[PDB]
Design a protein around this nucleic acid. Structure first.
Lengths: 141, 107, 122, 69, 114, 190
RNA sequence: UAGUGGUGCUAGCAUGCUGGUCACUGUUCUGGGCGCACGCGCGCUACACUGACGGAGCCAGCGAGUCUAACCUUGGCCGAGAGGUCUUGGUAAUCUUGUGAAACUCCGUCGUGCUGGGGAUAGAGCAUUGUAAUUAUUGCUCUUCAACGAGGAAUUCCUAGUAAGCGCAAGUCAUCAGCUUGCGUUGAUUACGUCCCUGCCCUGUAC
């Protein structure tokens, strides 16, 4: 058998995000290419056309490995260091509006669902889908 | 370091670890001075010959790679090759010469 | 074909630089404003400025000075809710430091602290 | 003076004939001995390597190392 | 003519305070939304009486209320604004709208290191 | 340590401006300018006064010494401003040229500065304001210190001014070289 | 009030593997003040490629919290952000909290140009604490882009999980630190000696 745990992290992400863009069901907010994704950032995402799908794949993988997550925890994960000009650096959380829509978009296509005890959990169909991409990723070598 | 050895495996063809050893042994000074004022010439122990070799090599690379177009590995690899040869082009060899000729005058 | 220097809005721009960065020679055109304008013009961001043809420098010039028609979110603009007329504007070229170097003089005329302190320092 | 940033046809011919002369090549090697900017060299290496004129021995974003073979 | 954010001067004076606050920037809107104290009401009471009895200008009324917003009802009045020490005399021209009174009376001298 | 006050009495009586504070320093304090040295050995001040008096007895661009007693010295106050913030002088080629010729004079007088650098030149258009730890031309490192001064002044004209019978471009020779009064004040090296 | 494994239920993959859900180890009121030609000192941020920016990977320890009423806040929803709103757990090895921290690692863009280094000074607008933010507490967005090319004479701290790099928590506290103390992460070079300098402690004649 094969699991998502059996594949290199960035290798899996690149494979799945490219596939997900071809499916076309993943729906974009449309304000994309304006938002910085974090108040700590400078300049927007450089891969202007593709970056939304690649983030969507990352979220799915991260939830797959864990019991459940919520929007607050994701904002922490994708945070970073803000320069504060002449002052010392500090940790700052990333944009919420992005990540909440990603969860809702992934739910529309049935990969993920709202869970008791709050937050979201992987669907059995999510498992079934992500495992199949993993098997292709190994065999495509 | 990993990138540095690879480069030396292509510029020249020897087992590059041997080239490192040659550079070290050829660089370490064998005579020096101390202040008395004036300076008096003195011999230097084999251990310190090794320490001086390593210090001079990295400094010669570091100051070449500042405001560079060549990466660290590109410059460090060249120092090692130049020092395995008798090549006075290298910074570390230039430094060795002055220490010994100064010491000669004061002995 | 390739042009090494070009002139627009009475500013000179050299062709040898990425188009997004080259435009920031113009007063008022910051990096983010420059970046978003190019996207709406759908020029190739990776082209160097000397590659573009006249009909492609136009449209860009047009969008810079009429930004609200292209549904730029207004909060992107540097002159929101103007004091005389509640319209929003973006200020460009020599028109920058003509509204600046005026609002302070308007404060001088009203004998406000900040105007006095500025001109007293001079 | 400034290095070239767009590929003239004459330099393209120059590149293909001369590069196999060198034992070792890298981004710095091209930018030093040929008057091209670094933003060309990154593209040219991917081109010539896929063309098979030079042999990769290691690649690491910040460093890449190609050889006569 | 003068105009304020597109509203013409002749429609000003007619505009009420609770209308005017809708044009003002965030600091003013919060101040009124957070509930301005009663203290201006006594000042406003006196200021109206002086204007009404005036033969031509109304002559100064003086106050400590440096933290008070300039509002169209008081255009044209002459006011003496306390300075921590002295009073400074000012006439409310229309351009002063939305400023604080404190901006017109300098609490400190220049310094010149003579 | 009341001598730190009472020491005035000779100068206070023999000297008429009250002066003003200019700056605290580690070895000395400075206050129409008065310099006060810093219990006994400082009455060093005589060495400084006679040294400055000699150089000003020569034609050199140095402040005129007036008077000196009890570790107190009085000097001409400088009109200029410190060279380290200069950026736009109208004749940088002559300024470069003639700063070089100043070094030649010291060498001809047998003396070399330790730190002929922008921290002690004030704005010929310039004056040299102090001579810490000067050495003779005969000292064993005279040429080493000599060439340091030449390169130090060259570096400044390159970095800020972009400049790079006389010396420099427009003259036969680019800059002087060491091979091309010490016995009265034997600061070091006879 | 902790962990592992089995046992019961159960999902995906393949014909075992990774996850979810019994045993063991005097008084008082209103307004102002606590400005800068310059000298001295402890700090913060930089001068870039051993880098800046974008995306992805993903790891701690020491603290602290409410019924006096309103502290630390999970989850859902709204918005570019700052922020708002509806519910919830914890008087605590039990909940916030695996405090998913930064440096760091990998894949791209940039190409030696005060440049995409650096972000002072300044203009417009939106929020938040407070009785009150003008001479301006703090946060967010766009625009303006200054000096600075590794720094003279002088001078500080330090011998191993130490220096240095990097970040967090507490303190004060309506709000507000570039401060103080404590904690963790990554982790060197150079001695293992002396009385030269500085300073301290012992035992009569040129002074």
């Amino acid at each position: 058998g094969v699991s998502v745990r059996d594949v290199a992290a960035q290798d899996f992400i690149n494979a799945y995000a490219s596939f997900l863009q071809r499916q076309g069901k993943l729906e974009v907010p449309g304000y994309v290419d304006i938002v910085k994704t974090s108040s700590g950032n400078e300049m927007p995402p450089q891969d202007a056309e593709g970056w939304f799908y690649k983030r969507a794949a990352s979220v799915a993988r991260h939830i797959y490995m864990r019991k459940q997550v919520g929007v607050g925890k994701l904002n922490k994960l994708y945070g970073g260091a803000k320069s504060r000009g002449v002052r010392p650096y500090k940790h700052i959380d990333a944009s919420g509006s992005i990540n909440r829509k990603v969860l809702q978009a992934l739910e529309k296509i049935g990969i993920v669902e709202i869970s008791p005890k709050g937050g979201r959990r992987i669907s059995e169909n999510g498992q079934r889908d992500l495992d199949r991409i993993a098997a292709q990723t190994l065999e495509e070598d | 370091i990993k990138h540095t050895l690879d480069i030396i495996n292509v510029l020249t063809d020897q087992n590059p670890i041997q080239v490192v050893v040659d550079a070290i042994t050829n660089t370490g000074p064998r005579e020096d001075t101390t202040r008395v004022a004036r300076r008096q010439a003195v011999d230097v122990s084999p251990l310190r010959r090794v320490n001086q070799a390593i210090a001079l090599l990295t400094i010669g690379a570091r100051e070449a790679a500042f405001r560079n177009i060549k990466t660290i590995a590109e410059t460090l690899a060249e120092e090692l090759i130049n020092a395995a040869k008798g090549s006075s082009t290298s910074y570390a060899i230039k430094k060795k010469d002055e220490l010994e000729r100064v010491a000669k005058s004061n002995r | 074909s390739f042009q090494h220097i070009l002139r627009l809005l009475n500013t000179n721009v050299d062709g040898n630089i990425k188009i997004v960065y080259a435009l920031t020679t113009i007063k008022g055109v910051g990096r983010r404003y420059s970046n978003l304008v190019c996207k709406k013009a759908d020029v190739d961001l990776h082209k160097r400025a000397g590659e573009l043809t006249q009909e492609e420098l136009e449209r860009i010039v047009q969008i810079m000075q009429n930004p609200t028609h292209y549904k730029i979110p207004a909060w992107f603009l540097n002159r929101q809710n103007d004091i005389t007329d509640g319209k929003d504007y973006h200020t460009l070229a020599n028109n920058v430091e003509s509204k600046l170097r005026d609002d302070l003089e308007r404060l001088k005329k009203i004998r406000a602290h900040r105007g006095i302190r500025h001109f007293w320092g001079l | 003076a400034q290095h070239a940033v767009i590929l003239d046809q004459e330099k393209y011919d120059r590149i293909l004939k001369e590069v196999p002369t060198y034992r070792y090549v890298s981004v710095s090697v091209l930018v030093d001995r040929l008057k091209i900017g670094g933003s060309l060299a990154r593209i040219a290496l991917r081109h010539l390597e896929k063309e098979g004129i030079i042999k990769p021995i290691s690649k690491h974003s910040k460093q890449a190392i190609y050889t006569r073979a | 003519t003068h105009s304020y954010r597109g509203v013409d001067l002749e429609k000003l004076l007619e505009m009420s305070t609770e209308d005017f606050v809708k044009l003002a920037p965030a600091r003013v809107r919060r101040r009124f939304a957070r509930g301005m104290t009663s203290k201006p009401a006594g000042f406003m009471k006196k200021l109206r009486a002086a204007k009404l009895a005036a033969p031509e200008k109304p002559a100064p009324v003086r106050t400590h209320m440096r933290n008070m917003i300039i509002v169209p009802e008081m255009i044209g009045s002459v006011v003496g604004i306390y300075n921590g020490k002295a009073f400074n005399q000012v006439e409310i021209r229309p351009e002063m709208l939305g400023h604080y009174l404190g901006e017109f009376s300098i609490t400190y001298t220049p310094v010149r290191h003579g | 340590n009341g001598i730190d006050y009472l020491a005035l009495k000779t100068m206070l009586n023999r000297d008429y401006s009250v002066g003003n504070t200019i700056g605290v320093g580690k070895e000395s304090d400075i206050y129409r300018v008065m310099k006060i040295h810093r219990m006994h050995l400082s009455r060093a001040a005589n060495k400084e006064y006679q040294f400055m008096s000699m150089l000003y007895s020569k034609g050199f661009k140095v402040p005129e010494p007036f008077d000196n007693s009890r570790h107190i010295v009085v000097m001409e106050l400088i009109e200029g401003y410190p060279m380290r913030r200069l950026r736009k002088h109208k004749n940088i080629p002559k300024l470069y040229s003639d700063l070089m010729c100043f070094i030649v004079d010291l060498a001809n007088s047998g003396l070399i500065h330790c730190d002929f650098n922008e921290f002690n030149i004030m704005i010929c258009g310039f004056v040299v304001i102090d001579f810490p730890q000067c050495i003779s031309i005969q000292h064993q490192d005279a040429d080493y210190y000599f060439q340091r001064d030449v390169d130090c002044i060259r570096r400044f004209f390159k970095k800020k001014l972009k400049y790079e019978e006389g010396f420099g471009d427009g003259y036969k020779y680019a800059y002087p070289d060491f091979k091309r009064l010490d016995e009265l004040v034997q600061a070091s090296g006879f």
